[PDB]
Scaffold this active site. Structure first.
Site, PDB file in Angstrom:
ATOM      1  N   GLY A   1      33.747  38.421  48.967  1.00 37.10           N
ATOM      2  CA  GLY A   1      33.769  37.249  50.749  1.00 37.10           C
ATOM      3  C   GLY A   1      34.995  36.169  50.526  1.00 37.10           C
ATOM      4  O   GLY A   1      35.078  35.635  51.426  1.00 37.10           O
TER       5      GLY A   1
ATOM      6  N   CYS B   1      37.610  35.652  49.062  1.00 37.23           N
ATOM      7  CA  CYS B   1      39.299  35.637  49.131  1.00 37.23           C
ATOM      8  C   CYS B   1      39.566  35.591  50.530  1.00 37.23           C
ATOM      9  O   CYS B   1      38.560  35.210  51.849  1.00 37.23           O
ATOM     10  CB  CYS B   1      39.140  37.097  49.186  1.00 37.23           C
ATOM     11  SG  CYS B   1      39.261  38.072  47.305  1.00 37.23           S
TER      12      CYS B   1
ATOM     13  N   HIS C   1      45.163  42.843  50.480  1.00 41.80           N
ATOM     14  CA  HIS C   1      44.628  43.742  49.885  1.00 41.80           C
ATOM     15  C   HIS C   1      43.478  43.971  51.123  1.00 41.80           C
ATOM     16  O   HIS C   1      42.289  44.046  51.039  1.00 41.80           O
ATOM     17  CB  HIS C   1      44.367  43.706  48.767  1.00 41.80           C
ATOM     18  CG  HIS C   1      42.425  41.897  48.574  1.00 41.80           C
ATOM     19  ND1 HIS C   1      43.077  41.494  47.971  1.00 41.80           N
ATOM     20  CD2 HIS C   1      41.528  41.754  49.209  1.00 41.80           C
ATOM     21  CE1 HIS C   1      42.702  40.648  47.983  1.00 41.80           C
ATOM     22  NE2 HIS C   1      41.702  41.031  48.661  1.00 41.80           N
TER      23      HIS C   1
HETATM   24  C1  LIG Z   1      37.186  38.876  47.869  1.00 38.21           C
HETATM   25  O1  LIG Z   1      37.669  39.019  48.804  1.00 38.21           O
HETATM   26  C2  LIG Z   1      36.882  39.597  46.073  1.00 38.21           C
HETATM   27  C3  LIG Z   1      37.006  37.558  45.445  1.00 38.21           C
HETATM   28  C4  LIG Z   1      35.927  38.074  43.924  1.00 38.21           C
HETATM   29  C5  LIG Z   1      34.892  38.480  44.146  1.00 38.21           C
HETATM   30  C6  LIG Z   1      33.792  38.854  43.032  1.00 38.21           C
HETATM   31  N1  LIG Z   1      34.373  36.963  42.935  1.00 38.21           N
HETATM   32  C7  LIG Z   1      34.962  37.167  43.409  1.00 38.21           C
HETATM   33  O2  LIG Z   1      36.223  36.049  42.648  1.00 38.21           O
HETATM   34  N2  LIG Z   1      37.921  39.815  46.127  1.00 38.21           N
HETATM   35  C8  LIG Z   1      37.486  41.216  44.965  1.00 38.21           C
HETATM   36  O3  LIG Z   1      36.963  42.155  44.987  1.00 38.21           O
HETATM   37  C9  LIG Z   1      39.141  41.637  43.978  1.00 38.21           C
HETATM   38  C10 LIG Z   1      39.307  43.024  45.195  1.00 38.21           C
HETATM   39  C11 LIG Z   1      40.332  43.869  45.039  1.00 38.21           C
HETATM   40  C12 LIG Z   1      41.164  45.069  46.551  1.00 38.21           C
HETATM   41  C13 LIG Z   1      41.695  45.660  45.358  1.00 38.21           C
HETATM   42  C14 LIG Z   1      43.622  44.781  45.407  1.00 38.21           C
HETATM   43  C15 LIG Z   1      43.194  44.557  44.262  1.00 38.21           C
HETATM   44  C16 LIG Z   1      41.731  43.200  44.409  1.00 38.21           C
HETATM   45  N3  LIG Z   1      38.387  42.536  43.202  1.00 38.21           N
HETATM   46  C17 LIG Z   1      38.438  42.332  41.876  1.00 38.21           C
HETATM   47  O4  LIG Z   1      38.167  41.035  42.136  1.00 38.21           O
HETATM   48  C18 LIG Z   1      38.655  42.753  40.908  1.00 38.21           C
HETATM   49  C19 LIG Z   1      39.056  44.078  40.316  1.00 38.21           C
HETATM   50  C20 LIG Z   1      38.214  44.131  39.067  1.00 38.21           C
HETATM   51  C21 LIG Z   1      38.465  45.514  38.396  1.00 38.21           C
HETATM   52  C22 LIG Z   1      37.762  44.940  36.964  1.00 38.21           C
HETATM   53  C23 LIG Z   1      38.104  43.412  36.546  1.00 38.21           C
HETATM   54  C24 LIG Z   1      37.293  43.107  37.150  1.00 38.21           C
HETATM   55  C25 LIG Z   1      38.264  43.006  38.199  1.00 38.21           C
HETATM   56  N4  LIG Z   1      38.350  41.335  39.396  1.00 38.21           N
END
Ligand SMILES: *C(=O)[C@H](C[C@@H]1CCNC1=O)NC(=O)[C@H](CC1CCCCC1)NC(=O)c1cc2ccccc2[nH]1
Ligand SMILES: *C(=O)[C@H](C[C@@H]1CCNC1=O)NC(=O)[C@H](CC1CCCCC1)NC(=O)c1cc2ccccc2[nH]1
Lengths: 301, 301
Positions: free
Chosen positions: A143, A145, A41
């Site tokens: 961040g 991830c 992603h």
């Molecule tokens: C990685 O960098 C982050 C890790 C998250 C940030 C907050 N705490 C964590 O563990 N990942 C994300 O922010 C993802 C990114 C998305 C990009 C597009 C493809 C799917 C992943 N998003 C989420 O973690 C996310 C989206 C979402 C929507 C609705 C409910 C929960 C939820 N979590």
């Protein structure tokens, strides 16, 4: 001695963490040999998170669109590919600090250490367990991830988890190092239920065996029970059904302490049906289930 | 996201651990530059543990009586010395993996990561706190002596603890990297009381601020209290007296969450006077006090 959550030394993995930047998105990657693994992603912008088509989005990206930095070093991308939900960025330079590793997909109930990273730099390490619902109760911010979970045996690092996203309940969902998500979760911005969070019964018993070794013994009773009798008192409290394989897994601890497995189950049965009455077991007021029957032995050596 | 005990990456310290053998006794040492630090009770045999005279015992030892092994490497001892309860073995080769470090004597209530080692090889890392009674609730087995506690800031490793012995209550006692024991403990085989184990009030409040950040808010109340009023309800439960310095330490968290410090004290007062009624705060059924007002900020960034 004492007993507490203990993670593996993170030195072997710190040398494999790198920064991955695809446009505005920046996260962490795993540098092993001449390949860098990261969540796919990264290619997603901000309006392509609900239901992105990673095939189409990846076609619009070239090698020069991915920047990898192992600290202040600049690794060149000579090839990219998408395996499941992970990106494999082929680099020109092989990691000089690559440890003897291997990609393994752990089972629900097993533990592993997580090295939380932000901007490619490790921030901390903590122990986690693969919950029965295929989630992990970790600590991740924006961040994080790209951070990976690993098990260190002798001199071989076994990577088993890469963080991808968080769930509405606060728990976290990720994939193995081959891009296969743990559980029915998908990498798309949408509410996804993780399911009922069951308790790892075999780990709780191992945690009780470690207790008797460290002096905590007030929970031991003059009682015993059958396997079916215990499983009936465990389904009501959302405890995983105890199998004969679990009993044999706890065999070494049973012969180590002299307490039969079915006797430990009798003690757990009363703990579930009567609580702890304000007492404490290994410094905890609740029943811990993130200590495998193998973490106790290697910590109570 | 999540919140849980998180230790610093142990890579910087793994490269400084070595094996120290003085006769039959074998434990771990810290290799920094051309010096190796280890507990001085290595020179002790088996009948010199009740009240050994380290001066006399050290006179009977020469440089060739100490063997240091940084893995399979063999470091030569060209000089030895005894500073307080620690031995400084001068070696001929300086550690090529020596990080930017410094010896610091932490204060009661501060946290630090411990890298448990056996036979010179790291085994695991976990977070610890300097209890008010100057003890640490860690996990150590035979041979764990020489393991160190450290804090990593930016790129400077701050060593602050070296394990020496265990107490009758199961807790552990050690010294700083200059050989000065933490607390009134001495390195002699004798029963030594650690004193009443008080609770770090400022850390509990910081743990409650981290809770409100992660969604746990059921403990917040419409109540408030004074500093003297809270300290009176804290002495009965063996809680360290809260000072104005503690309030200012929690200032950043207070303005971060919008909950006044004295209001948090009002919530803690009810928790101490009425318990948790079966609820859970950040996954714990008890009040944690090993999260400093600084670990929450760096984990809840
Ligand atoms: C990685 O960098 C982050 C890790 C998250 C940030 C907050 N705490 C964590 O563990 N990942 C994300 O922010 C993802 C990114 C998305 C990009 C597009 C493809 C799917 C992943 N998003 C989420 O973690 C996310 C989206 C979402 C929507 C609705 C409910 C929960 C939820 N979590
Ligand atoms: C270091 O290698 C060990 C660490 C211990 C082993 C079990 N768990 C631990 O934390 N240290 C010891 O075994 C010391 C060695 C002594 C050598 C002579 C000088 C004093 C230290 N001993 C103890 O930890 C010890 C002795 C003793 C006597 C009575 C009650 C408790 C007690 N603990």
């Amino acid at each position: 001695s004492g007993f507490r959550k203990m993670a593996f030394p993170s030195g072997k993995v710190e040398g494999c963490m790198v920064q991955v930047i695809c446009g505005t998105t920046t996260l962490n990657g795993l540098w092993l040999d001449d390949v860098v693994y990261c969540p796919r992603h990264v290619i997603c912008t901000s309006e392509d998170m609900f239901n992105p088509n990673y095939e189409d989005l990846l076609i619009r990206k070239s090698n020069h669109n991915f920047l990898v930095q192992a600290g202040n070093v600049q690794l060149r991308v000579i090839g990219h590919s998408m395996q499941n939900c992970v990106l494999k960025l082929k680099v020109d330079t092989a990691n000089p600090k690559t440890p003897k590793y291997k990609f393994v997909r752990i089972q629900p109930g097993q533990t592993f250490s997580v090295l939380a990273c932000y901007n490619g730099s490790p921030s901390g390490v903590y122990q986690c367990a693969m919950r029965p619902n295929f989630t992990i109760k970790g600590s991740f911010l924006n961040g994080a991830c790209g951070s990976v979970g690993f098990n260190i045996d002798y001199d071989c690092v076994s990577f088993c988890y890469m963080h991808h996203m968080v769930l509405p309940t606060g728990v976290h969902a990720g994939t193995d190092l081959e891009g296969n998500f743990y559980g029915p979760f998908v990498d798309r911005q949408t509410a996804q239920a993780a399911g009922t969070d069951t308790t790892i019964t075999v780990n709780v018993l191992a945690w009780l065996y470690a207790a008797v070794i460290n002096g905590d013994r007030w929970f031991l009773n003059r009682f015993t029970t059958t396997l079916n009798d215990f499983n009936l008192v465990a389904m009501k409290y959302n405890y995983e059904p105890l199998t004969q394989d679990h009993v044999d897994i706890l065999g070494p601890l049973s012969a180590q302490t002299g307490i039969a497995v079915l006797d430990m189950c009798a003690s757990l049965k009363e703990l579930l049906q009567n609580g702890m009455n304000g007492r404490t077991i290994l410094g905890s007021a609740l029943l811990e289930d993130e200590f495998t029957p193998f973490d106790v032995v290697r910590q109570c050596s």
